[PDB]
Amino acid sequence: ASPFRLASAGEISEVQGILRTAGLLGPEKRIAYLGVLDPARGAGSEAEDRRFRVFIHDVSGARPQEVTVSVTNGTVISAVELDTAATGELPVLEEEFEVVEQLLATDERWLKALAARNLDVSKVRVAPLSAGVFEYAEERGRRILRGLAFVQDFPEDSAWAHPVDGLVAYVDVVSKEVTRVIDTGVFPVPAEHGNYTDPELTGPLRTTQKPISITQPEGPSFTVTGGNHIEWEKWSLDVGFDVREGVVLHNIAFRDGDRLRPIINRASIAEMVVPYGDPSPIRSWQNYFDTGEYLVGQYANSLELGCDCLGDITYLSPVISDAFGNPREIRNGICMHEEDWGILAKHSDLWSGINYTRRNRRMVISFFTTIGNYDYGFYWYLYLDGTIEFEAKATGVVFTSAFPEGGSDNISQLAPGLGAPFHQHIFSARLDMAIDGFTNRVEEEDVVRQTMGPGNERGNAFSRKRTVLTRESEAVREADARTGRTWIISNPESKNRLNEPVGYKLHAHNQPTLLADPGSSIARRAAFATKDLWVTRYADDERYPTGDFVNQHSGGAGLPSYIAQDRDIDGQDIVVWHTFGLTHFPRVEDWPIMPVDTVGFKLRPEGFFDRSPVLDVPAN
Amino acid sequence: ASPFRLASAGEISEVQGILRTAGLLGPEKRIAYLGVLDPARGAGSEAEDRRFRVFIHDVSGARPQEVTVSVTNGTVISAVELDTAATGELPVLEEEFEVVEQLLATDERWLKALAARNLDVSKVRVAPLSAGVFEYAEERGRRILRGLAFVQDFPEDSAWAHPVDGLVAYVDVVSKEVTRVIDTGVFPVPAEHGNYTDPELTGPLRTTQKPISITQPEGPSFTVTGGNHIEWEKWSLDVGFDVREGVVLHNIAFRDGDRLRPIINRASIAEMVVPYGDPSPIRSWQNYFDTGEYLVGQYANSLELGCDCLGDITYLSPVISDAFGNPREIRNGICMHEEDWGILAKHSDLWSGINYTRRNRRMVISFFTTIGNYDYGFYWYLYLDGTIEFEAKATGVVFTSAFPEGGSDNISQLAPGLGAPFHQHIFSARLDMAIDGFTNRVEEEDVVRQTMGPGNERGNAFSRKRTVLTRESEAVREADARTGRTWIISNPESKNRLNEPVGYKLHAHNQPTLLADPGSSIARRAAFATKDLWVTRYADDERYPTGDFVNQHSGGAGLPSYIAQDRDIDGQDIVVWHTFGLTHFPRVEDWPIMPVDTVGFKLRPEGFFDRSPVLDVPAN
Numbered sequence A, B: 001a002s003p004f005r006l007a008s009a010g011e012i013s014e015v016q017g018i019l020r021t022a023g024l025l026g027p028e029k030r031i032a033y034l035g036v037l038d039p040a041r042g043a044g045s046e047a048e049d050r051r052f053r054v055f056i057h058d059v060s061g062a063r064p065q066e067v068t069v070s071v072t073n074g075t076v077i078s079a080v081e082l083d084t085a086a087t088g089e090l091p092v093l094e095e096e097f098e099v100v101e102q103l104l105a106t107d108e109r110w111l112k113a114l115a116a117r118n119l120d121v122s123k124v125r126v127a128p129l130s131a132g133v134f135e136y137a138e139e140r141g142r143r144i145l146r147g148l149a150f151v152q153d154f155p156e157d158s159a160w161a162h163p164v165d166g167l168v169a170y171v172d173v174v175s176k177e178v179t180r181v182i183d184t185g186v187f188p189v190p191a192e193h194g195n196y197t198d199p200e201l202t203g204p205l206r207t208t209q210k211p212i213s214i215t216q217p218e219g220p221s222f223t224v225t226g227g228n229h230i231e232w233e234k235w236s237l238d239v240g241f242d243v244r245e246g247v248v249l250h251n252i253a254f255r256d257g258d259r260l261r262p263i264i265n266r267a268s269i270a271e272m273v274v275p276y277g278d279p280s281p282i283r284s285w286q287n288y289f290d291t292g293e294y295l296v297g298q299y300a301n302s303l304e305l306g307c308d309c310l311g312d313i314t315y316l317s318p319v320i321s322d323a324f325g326n327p328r329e330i331r332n333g334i335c336m337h338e339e340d341w342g343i344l345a346k347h348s349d350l351w352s353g354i355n356y357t358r359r360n361r362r363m364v365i366s367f368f369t370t371i372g373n374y375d376y377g378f379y380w381y382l383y384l385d386g387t388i389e390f391e392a393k394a395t396g397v398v399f400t401s402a403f404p405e406g407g408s409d410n411i412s413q414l415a416p417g418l419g420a421p422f423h424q425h426i427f428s429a430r431l432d433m434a435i436d437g438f439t440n441r442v443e444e445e446d447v448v449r450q451t452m453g454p455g456n457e458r459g460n461a462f463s464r465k466r467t468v469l470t471r472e473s474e475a476v477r478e479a480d481a482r483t484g485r486t487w488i489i490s491n492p493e494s495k496n497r498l499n500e501p502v503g504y505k506l507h508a509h510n511q512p513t514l515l516a517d518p519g520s521s522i523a524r525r526a527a528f529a530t531k532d533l534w535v536t537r538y539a540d541d542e543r544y545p546t547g548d549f550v551n552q553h554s555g556g557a558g559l560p561s562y563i564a565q566d567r568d569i570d571g572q573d574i575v576v577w578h579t580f581g582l583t584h585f586p587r588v589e590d591w592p593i594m595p596v597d598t599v600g601f602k603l604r605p606e607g608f609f610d611r612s613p614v615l616d617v618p619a620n
Ligand SMILES: [Cu+2]
Pocket: A394, A423, A424, A425, A584
């Protein structure tokens, strides 16, 4: 019954049928994006209208379309032709991943470049890389991918060990033409292999690890109903999945006594970008919007038991559209389980004689995706005590280059002749807040140091201050770790038993934000990434911090455009957009396959409850 | 055989015997501190000399002594009388915890104060609190404790719910006299109970938690030999225990191929302080050095299985001295176990077809201590990938006060009339570094942003810089989260296969440091807490950032005095002292017993290894 249920194979087939019937999905059409839309505000009272949004590409060169369909009613709600030079190109298509290599393989300029390096064309892999927006006037309105080459010595070889530096090509993937081949000079192609399953490199595998067995003999403590509605230790939510964003959480709420209290209406990673900090012309255009350009959900891994997810696991298998509108299941693409999380609360009291210990747990909802060389795990955690946390786990194989003779200020050395350009991985979490309902506001809270003097004669006092963010023009904020800066989302009309507005406090990691010069193309295209926290007034068309069409799209859309409306956010339906990232100077330990590193944020209750919410957790 | 083995009951009895024989431990003597000393540098070549350091108090008012004993040889090495007005009072004795309440109960000023508030003296608990150093000239050279009162309605009641504000007393615990009773006026004693095992407050306990069973059917992957030598997944270390510092790690090293490579010679929490930020004269003197004044090891809990520590647990039961020199065992005071830690590394490669997943694990060494109202867990983690981490878990019951009518800038409200003064918990980790041996140096590494222009025409480049800390005068450093500041400890004479010095990078949480005015007593006594990172040249008498005797001791010792020597630290035997803390504005959710909150730091290999050290971890 839930209008927040996952899309079914039947719904996708039905979208396909509706589009076909309407004349919108002929043989030259391809689906670049398809997803279910969330219910409108206040829609709970009226019957279901399941609506799907679709981006349709045309392989014959005609203009693409944005279409909204009502699958409930079997109708097209809207269909509009896109001018991509203005509003952006559609996301990269799965079917385009081979095309850059294939076209380049019979291009005389490319062949000449490979022959100069004594490389067999049959062994040269070409990564199909997003192009961005730079100085090349001919690319405006054209679907371009750029290609960087990596040598694969044999079918099972890791090509990332053998980058071909000094060479890049640009390709029109619709007209199937090579627009440019740039060769700045030969660099040695690094020779050592990076085959992390080769016994010669691993050596003898360890025999020292004894098994760890995690079981739940009575099954898990959470229930799943309606396909994707979770109930666990007072928490209530729906687990969505979108081909762009991946796992999306809806209707996060906590049952406090008899009342189901909303906390967050929708939580997602709405963008993620990987900007590279190497000024070589071979890579200086490199910025991968894994979410906006590639669609991270589309590449979600099938997760194997006792392996990717350990313990008593409940899986969801979300369905997405292929390029023709046929449903494709991602088998075991979402893991759900609960985990022990050490001590929750503990006190041994001298005066009462009472010794008390309770254990913590968390509910985990995750998926893992692969974007070329990168693999990322996206983890959402709900804790017994009301805390909500997100963690990203970055692994895979680092993107490589040559390591210049005489070193580099922008590239680290991994192996002889092998470099790894510096880069960042920067995420935007979009948290459509609903603290005890939709009437919310945000305050920035700083620690306040106090001067020794009257009222503070021993110079020990310290305090804090809160500044309400009243309008969008005032709500673009930066971190200040030194002053312990956090942001509190509260409901000014809902008070706890102490007559204080209920709230949740966002605790950031205060990692560096986007490092690029403010006048760069990337600082404009990923403007969201330049500041730690943005707050907007909710609008149904304000979905991504980079806008709907990121591929080859200049600035003009996204968060800077939204906040220009300067809307009231003081006791209104608001959305918090938190930027957080990893700055990666690759280390030798990252090669040939990288150990996981992490980043994230959390939100903790701040006078939301009337006392600890975990007093009813039982012993042992 | 190991000179790093835990102290045995026999060794403590033997220290007692040696002291007795030497005339140093008559009936009026009490042991305030006793611990084994680490072996001298280069001592491995000569036979064992187990030496113990002892602080001896005299209950009849004579001067205390610092004594070093050789238990191996049965001799007193040194014994010196202390002038406590100069060098500090000895740590608070367990036997003094009752004395403040007992003396106050027959004092007419105290009795008058309680009668003004209609409080039955038999129900008034008095916390025995460290005094610090303020304006009271008569306290210099005297052992003083201060007392704050809390009402206990019945034997099992949580007295913390019922603070008696407006009242404080000072007591000489040797002469057994009450020096001052200060009554600034009556405040309502908060009435609601805080009994977190009372069904009236908890409500019906949850029946929704299904069991989680963590077992190791073949036993653990670590070995323990010589009582406390651990070997686990290439790591090697010895687990020490000291009554002051608690768990101390010695000789942390990693077996890389055939070579045992040192990383850290000694790791401990060498101090921890809890400064309070309430300017009321009732509490403005409050700063608890839990380590230096109270001795956190002494109060380590006995940890119950399936409860405090879950899984296949190996315990150590360290032995300490009681006040008379008799050995006392802390049964199951140290937990050791390995834990699954999610995904270690993962890649699904498009070109090779190879899908690869490996799981991570960590070795955990922990203890939990109780200091009055506070309970703290101290956790050390070793990970497969070479990472070393510390985490402190803070829980217990918050220290309370009245909540003033009309609010407070320095106290939060928890319940009707019940306040919690703002405070911090600030730790100092002392890391005697040995990166590939003792010849080490520290660099501060910052991210470097670059301007769009020649050499960087697209404005995408970013870099980093490292500054070697060459002498102690230059090695007192602050955090800079915005620039991604870290500190690298390297060995300039030990290079990896890429001709780079091997190293480890310290990643701080960049939480606020000590907030008190720089001219306060606490800023001087806890000077270490005002800066994030200090580096000293190793010296055997430079053990604690606050010096040997913290109780009622002004500035003059500790880190500021050590670094004045301005010694060479550029390729020398050095020690890193990292300050990290929690700033706590108590929330309603913290009452009546606080959910765990955490702080810590970690160190990750940085070109220490020649490639990933976990390529030999087996599948599944
Ligand atoms: Cu990276």
